[PDB]
């Protein structure tokens, strides 16, 4: 029924869209820089 090439396109787009969620948990396990971790009293 469905075309494998249109299905490959449509779910490479879904795979790429998911990576923007996963980075929000990677940043805590790898201890990347986060805006919320920066203590406010420290000079710029």
């Amino acid at each position: 029924s469905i075309d494998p090439e249109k299905l490959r396109d449509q779910l490479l787009d879904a795979f790429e869209n998911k990576q923007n969620e996963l980075k929000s948990s990677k940043a805590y396990y790898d201890a990347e820089r986060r805006p919320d971790a920066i203590g406010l009293a420290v000079p710029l």
Binding site: P35, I38, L40, A41, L44
Partner: protein
């Protein structure tokens, strides 16, 4: 011309002025009006149609000049040996100014409790 007049200043200052004191009063009135306008841009508009607000601003201009033209020569005492006077110890004033209560009459009093707010830019 100004809203108040040398006739208004002379209504409070019971001594009738000489021509030197008239030109002084005309410039001090212009300074008092210009001082009120810089605090209240609407002044001439309010005074065009509110007849009691006219009486506020005219009597306050006349007072603001009166307290500066009263005894402007700076004499304490004077005599010719047949007549003499001396005055109460008046403040030797040198500027025109409008009182905190006169700004409250004009409706623009300011409060004496204010706040300093600490601030730091939030990160990103």
């Amino acid at each position: 011309a100004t809203l108040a007049t040398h006739e208004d200043v002379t209504a409070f200052w019971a001594r009738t002025p000489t021509a030197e004191e008239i030109v002084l009063i005309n410039r001090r009135l212009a300074q008092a009006e210009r001082m009120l306008l810089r605090a209240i841009p609407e002044l001439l508009i309010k005074a065009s149609s509110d007849p009691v607000f006219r009486a506020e601003v005219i009597d306050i201009e006349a007072e603001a000049v009166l307290r500066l033209v009263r005894n402007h020569e700076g004499y304490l005492s004077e005599t010719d040996g047949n007549y003499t006077y001396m005055l109460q110890a008046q403040d030797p004033n040198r500027k025109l100014e409008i009182l905190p209560e006169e700004w409250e009459v004009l409706g623009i009093v300011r409060s004496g409790l204010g706040i300093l707010v600490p601030t730091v830019v939030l990160p990103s």
